[PDB]
Nucleic acid binder design. Structure first.
Lengths: 333, 197
RNA sequence: AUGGUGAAAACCAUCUAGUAGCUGGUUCCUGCCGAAGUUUCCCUCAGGAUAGCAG
RNA sequence: AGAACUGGCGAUGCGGGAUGAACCGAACGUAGAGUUAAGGUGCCGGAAUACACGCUCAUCAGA
RNA sequence: CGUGGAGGUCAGUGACGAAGCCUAGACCGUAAGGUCGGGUCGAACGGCCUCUAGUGCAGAUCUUGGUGGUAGUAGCAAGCGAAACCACAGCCAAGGGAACGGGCUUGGCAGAAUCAGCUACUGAU
RNA sequence: GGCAUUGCCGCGAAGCUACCAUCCGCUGGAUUAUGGCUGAACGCCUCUAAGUCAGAAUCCAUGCUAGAACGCGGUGAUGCUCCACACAGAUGGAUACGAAUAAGGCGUCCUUGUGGCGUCGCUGAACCAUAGCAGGCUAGCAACGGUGCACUUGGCGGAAAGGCCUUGGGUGCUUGCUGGCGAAUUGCAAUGCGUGGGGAUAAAUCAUUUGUAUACGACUUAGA
């Protein structure tokens, strides 16, 4: 087979780490480079294709897409990395004082017996006008070429019972390192939204650990160039409603996804299929560069979203459609 | 004559330097070569680039992972040129190499401390005027080493932090030169001069 | 070979420590001397008959 | 290829030639000190990164 | 120089310990070996001048006896339990003249210990 | 339906699992061949000798896979206490500009410069330190300095900062100069910070549970 994917062996964790990051544009202000979420289901989309010079120009096209459940991810720290003759080197990490129960759970393999003594004397180290905290922020403000942000998942918002927040690193491609640490200063403990990283019609790339079977499977894979079709919002009702369809419905199928619950928060609808399976954590990066082709150019018009019960079969979209067709039954009246 | 003898590659010749650094070890003489990257060889560049790659194609058969490990980093590139003249096996050796420390650039805690040069191994004192001659730097770069940049930059910084120093100093010894210049002539002086001082 | 025992071609015991144009092995120390690699016919092939070198 | 002639190894260590049946030096009681042979003195390697005259740039010089 | 026995001699040594056996013990002899201390032992033994011989071992696919590695392996159609075999070890490159490289020379290199596949190699602690 | 070495037949989720299906499968330098530019050798010419521009699916990075089990960093968590014991080569000083070498330092004047004038190198053979019982005990004078030490004020050093500077005060020393005592007999050389148990509190492993993992381990989980 493929000689490049060797050794074809098992990954270190469920949360795979991103080996590279996008380059830099110093002229821009501070922006995140990647965002994390959980893979959940495979839905059907039909839409009119506004692709010029095509065999399917202005025609309706069917294609299967995936909906990654993405909760608002919250910052709990920031890191500085110096440039060395031996690569990079973390000189200092610094944290946000008031951490959730979820991140505190990550630092223990046995949460139940533990006395929950996580960031106690470190929070006592904060307890003043800075002096030690502001010193280490100044340390990163002096040296360290690349500045990475420590974030975690709001797992309680997620319908999964895993209850253990995944820590990841996301660098910043907004130049002048002083602004990087000052952005992170303003954004300690703060919850970062999904639409405040990606928009619709953007080519992106996802990282994941691939569906294990028996050694075969359970590798970390990175597939590139995937178009985000819909950046949804949980507080916004009628997510399944397009500009065309406009029927008040959630993107979630009747009785949740296959092996996954309801979507009571933000979501990303990625073209095709992301690696890994449902209940698996993914991290969406932003393409590394300007990927300008006509595959990237077109701004899509989503016509209709399939929300039929994938569990078995589906002839209906909403529960309203079931009783509209069936009429009334015995247990009803 | 000095526990440690920090040397500065900058403008030297792998082989000669090495050699002389070799002897110095086998004779209990701690050493520390610096600015490694800004070392020098002899003969065009395309040369050393070959008389190396060849050293690259090396590698073991059945298991390339157990053969001649081709180090890119200059410091190393040079460290080899050296471990090549030092039994580097019999304890007498190990004992040596154990007395070395080739750094790329000039990291603390030496930066702050004097250095020197092996007058019997200078491009400018061995190579006939205008005559091709590598510069490790490029050579390394061309074959892996992924930092020429870092050191580079992360260098200029060092020169600053210092240059600034010197000034303060130079501006200091400007006084002395006067202090004595004046306090000179007097008596106590005269005398010394006589004896020589 | 002699004499014997067994049996739908044999074994036992002596003669017999049989006979070798050979194979393997051959048991302490020191000192001193110290080669030859070959001449000529018996024909040579086998073993020698002699001269040479060392006493 | 054959014939004749004198050596070397054969029965023979030792210094040197990176390493060696045929090369170079040197025929060995046990030691101490001194001087050399052949071969060497950038380093591995004991010994001049000695001195002096010139010549040589080679995209795998040359020894 | 040494061993078994014989003649002679040392009015030799010897239960207050002969012979033997060991010993990170000491001395002598170029050496064969000889002498002594310490420990163990329990009854005979040695030097000297001579005599005599079944007299001195690393080998013989030696003979006899004993004991290993192999191995707690193959095996029995947690326990029981061999044998073949065994100078000694087992990384590559290059040179080592001679259908000789496995010990050498010059390099590359090399961390204890172990199981499983076709000692490498995949992988796992 | 008790049973049928897995009784036959109709169909079937979960799984085993497939070009028998679907999705995904990258951009910057440096070059060869060559095409050039400036231009000698060789008073013309010339892609070349000294330079320089472009350029092959090449090369090397970017990206991707693994992470040295003796490569390294940052961060969270308290190791503390009670008894008993045990103890690869220092010998004045690593004495900080960078760049160039057919060129450079240092000092001065400024016309602020690829500026002028002066001066240095030909080795560290220097520089700074250097006198006292292996360096004592006591008295002054002259300096207002030098220097050690424990403190304090302020500042800098992230490349491996893990150090370097400074302010103030206190306390020694001063061989800068002059003194006052002691040295023997050392006999004429032989340099002269862990254990083994308690207690208190952090954590890990086993056992249990879960399965996204699985030959066995390992790995993911959950439980005062």
């Amino acid at each position: 087979g493929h000689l490049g994917f060797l050794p074809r062996k098992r990954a270190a964790s469920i949360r795979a780490r991103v080996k590279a990051f996008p380059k830099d544009d110093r002229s821009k202000p501070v922006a995140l480079t990647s965002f994390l979420g959980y893979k959940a289901g495979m839905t059907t989309i039909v839409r009119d294709l506004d692709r010029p010079g095509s065999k399917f120009h202005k025609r309706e096209v069917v294609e299967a897409v995936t909906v990654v459940d993405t909760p608002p991810v919250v910052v709990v720290g920031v890191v500085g990395y110096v440039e060395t003759p031996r690569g990079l080197r973390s000189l200092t990490t610094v944290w946000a004082e008031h951490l959730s129960d979820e991140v505190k759970r990550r630092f223990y393999k046995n949460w139940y017996k533990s006395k929950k003594k996580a960031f106690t004397k470190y929070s006592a180290k904060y307890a003043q006008d800075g002096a030690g905290i502001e010193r280490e922020l100044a340390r990163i403000k002096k040296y360290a070429s690349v500045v990475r942000v420590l974030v975690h998942t709001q797992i309680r918002k997620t319908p999964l019972a895993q209850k253990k927040a995944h820590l990841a690193e996301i660098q910043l491609n907004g130049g002048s390192i002083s602004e990087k640490v000052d952005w992170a200063r303003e954004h300690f403990e703060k919850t970062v939204a999904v639409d405040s990283v990606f928009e619709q019609n953007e080519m992106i790339d996802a990282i994941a650990v691939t569906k294990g079977h028996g050694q075969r499977g359970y590798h970390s894979r990175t597939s590139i160039n995937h178009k985000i079709y819909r950046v949804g919002k949980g507080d916004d009702e009628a997510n399944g409603a397009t500009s065309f369809d406009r029927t008040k419905k959630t993107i979630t199928p009747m009785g949740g996804f296959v092996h996954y619950g309801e979507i009571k928060n933000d979501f990303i609808m990625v073209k095709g299929c992301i690696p890994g399976n449902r209940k698996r954590i993914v991290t969406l990066r932003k393409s590394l560069y300007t990927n300008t082709s006509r595959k990237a150019l077109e701004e899509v018009s989503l016509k209709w979203i399939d929300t039929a019960s994938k569990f078995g079969k589906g002839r209906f979209q909403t529960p309203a459609e079931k009783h509209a067709f069936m009429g009334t039954l015995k247990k009803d009246l | 004559v000095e526990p440690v003898v920090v040397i500065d590659g900058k403008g030297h010749l792998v082989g000669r330097l090495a050699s002389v650094v070799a002897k110095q070890l086998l004779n209990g003489q701690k050493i520390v070569v610096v600015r490694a990257e800004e070392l020098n060889i002899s003969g065009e560049f395309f040369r050393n680039k070959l008389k190396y790659h060849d050293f690259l194609r090396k590698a073991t058969a059945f298991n390339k992972t157990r053969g001649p490990f081709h180090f890119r980093a200059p410091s190393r590139i040079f460290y080899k040129a050296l471990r090549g003249m030092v039994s580097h096996k019999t304890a007498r050796g190990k004992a040596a190499l154990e007395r070395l420390k080739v750094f790329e650039g000039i990291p603390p805690p030496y930066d702050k401390k004097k250095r020197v040069v092996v007058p019997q191994a200078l491009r400018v004192l061995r190579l006939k005027p205008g005559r091709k001659y590598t510069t490790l730097g490029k050579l390394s770069t061309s074959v892996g080493w992924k930092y020429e940049d870092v050191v580079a930059k992360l260098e200029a910084k060092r020169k600053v932090s210092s240059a600034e120093y010197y000034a303060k100093k130079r501006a200091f010894t400007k006084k002395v030169a006067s202090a004595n210049a004046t306090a000179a002539e007097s008596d106590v002086a005269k005398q010394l001069a006589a004896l020589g001082y």
